[PDB]
Amino acid sequence: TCPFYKKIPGTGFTVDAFQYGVVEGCTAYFLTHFHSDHYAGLSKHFTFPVYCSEITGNLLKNKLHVQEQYIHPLPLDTECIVNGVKVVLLDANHCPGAVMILFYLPNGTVILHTGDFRADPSMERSLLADQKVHMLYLDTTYCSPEYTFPSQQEVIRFAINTAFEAVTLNPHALVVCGTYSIGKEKVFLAIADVLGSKVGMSQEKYKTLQCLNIPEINSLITTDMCSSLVHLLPMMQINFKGLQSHLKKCGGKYNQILAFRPTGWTHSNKFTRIADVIPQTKGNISIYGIPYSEHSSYLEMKRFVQWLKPQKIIPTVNVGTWKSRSTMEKYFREWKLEAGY
Template sequence: MSGTLIANTPIAVDFWRIQKKRHARLFFLSHMHSDHTAGLTSTWRHRIYCSPVTGKILHHQLQVKKSLICSLELAVGHKIDLDELGLQTMTVTLIDANHCPGSVMFLFEGYFGTILHTGDFRYHPSMLQHPPLNNTRIDVLYLDNTNFSPNKKLPSREEATKQIKDIIKEHPEHDVVFGLYKIGKEKLMVELAKEFKSRIVVSPQKLELLNLLELEDVFEAGGGAGRISVVQESDVNRLNMNHWNQAHPTIAILPTSRPAKEWHKNYDVHVVPYSDHSSYQELQEFLNILKPCSLEPIVKHQMCEVLLKDYAQPLKKPLLEIKVPPSVQVFMMGLGCPERYGQGKAAKRQVVQAARQIPKGVVFEALEEHAHASKDLRGELQSVLNSCAAGSLCHTEDCTNRPLSYGPKKNDGKKGRYSILPRKCVPWRHIKKL
């Protein structure tokens, strides 16, 4: 999982390697599993939008500054600017993803249409029975397709929980070790604690995290408190199984949809298909009701992409044909942005370097091709240019403080091409190379 860059927008979901894609400007975190935070560290310096629970875990685990964490309430539309001037905005709504504590789906609505990014999720019918998804046309769906395979049969969580309880009842004299990720399956453990009247033993570090989630008081750090304990999934191995069984008869349970390994049977390790991702049948139901116009699988797999094509409805206006508003293009370039470059000659050099690396997709086309453009569009562009000249977008020390007109540069030999930046901020020779 390397995250998602949504085409023709400054939006990035679970994507943190911005040195490769500099046009990403708005960053969203769906949940705190490690495969969705790769590249995110305490040195991160851009605002992150996430759920309140994820925000707490993010600061606790990765020490990201609280000032950069923007926690958004679920099931409420939030207006976010798509440029420096507020000319273009979008609405984002967070929806419970039913995956792990704090996990959410993102519903984006703006000039690009309506986009739903599921992150990791376990489908439940209630998701589509209430706003905002009960009566919304989805132009593009980024889908968690982890289990989208006709050959992969998964029970419901309730059925899987019953299987786990039966295994524990079959071993009344054994200690039980669960191999889990750092986050996830907390509700399962609370239910087992009540069923077997046992405290759940965890590490001190795990207990700190669980206290943030404000769960029921069934967890405890230190040995001897109960017969059920939790360790990292990777700690359930041959060496530890031998060690645990030397002290007391012990079984291990791995609640995961991944297949069992050969050695598991010989060491009393039980793999139960308890999954926090939607099953194939659940995904079919979700797609048949939602009827998205276009589908993008989050997990790239050729066979899966072929199967998913049958569930997409014809898209009247493909995302790739949607024109990015001029002010958003400036925002995506990041040129002249004070929070990114600051002021002075050193800032100017950074701007020039960034200009060289801007993808061709954000360079304006020839004016002749846009002669039919509306007065509103031209007015918006003039607004951006004037704001840049006034210092709203450009903060280099030798920027000209006068309104700029759009059009080709005189005597440059490149008719029809133009820059939306002051000539002295980014020399024309750098823009024309893009």
């Protein structure tokens, strides 16, 4: 059964609720982004209307084979009417095609669902500036002050300079990047670009990347592994066994692997600066874990909320424990008292 925090009251609508069967009274299913915890339950047999971005609709059609007739793509930053209710989609600064949804209820309430997001000051000059939001359904993934990480710009800078140095010292080194869902594409794209190579990958991953409307993509990626010196692999293979094995297959083209695991947050953020990060090494294989996040830091989240000044906040992440729920409610109150709303 569908939880309350996936329901938009006063409407026929749910959000990211595809794993509950037929939801009683839901007449349109919104999907915020193509990550499996959120799409769970969609397939080619789904027969109700789905509303989402263009990119999210490309993946629905090509990867889960949902029939065209039920996919309803919407443009961003545009007032649209759905079953008599005004809605707007906004960039969530998460993975490709990830949106926030504004619902303008018939009775005058305004609701913002962030879906998954990385808060940014640039959202303060979206169509959010123009009016008041009563309810915020918030991605509270890193809602605790210990969650700090660098900007995405600093992390990419670290990865580019690391890879460029290594390969210029040893032209026979191969660079490998771990992946398991969409998002974080900039990690492997920016590395390839500085190395003058295309990114090589399996057919299934190539297909996935072909749905994301990235400009000049055909110039950046390929299925011919032999022609590329940056290879993508499944995240589970980004370990010393997985990498030695993969090196066998390259057939004596390369004598060194430099690999990157893009994670979210890890406790080595409590002590270490991005500049100071070092790999784990075994023989001719080094692995760097790098804190490239697509969720709000605690401070980025706080700023966004204190700008928005919502009347009520409903968390969508970390909701299954009382300790979490209680901790989050305390920060909400602090933030409200500090800013004075």
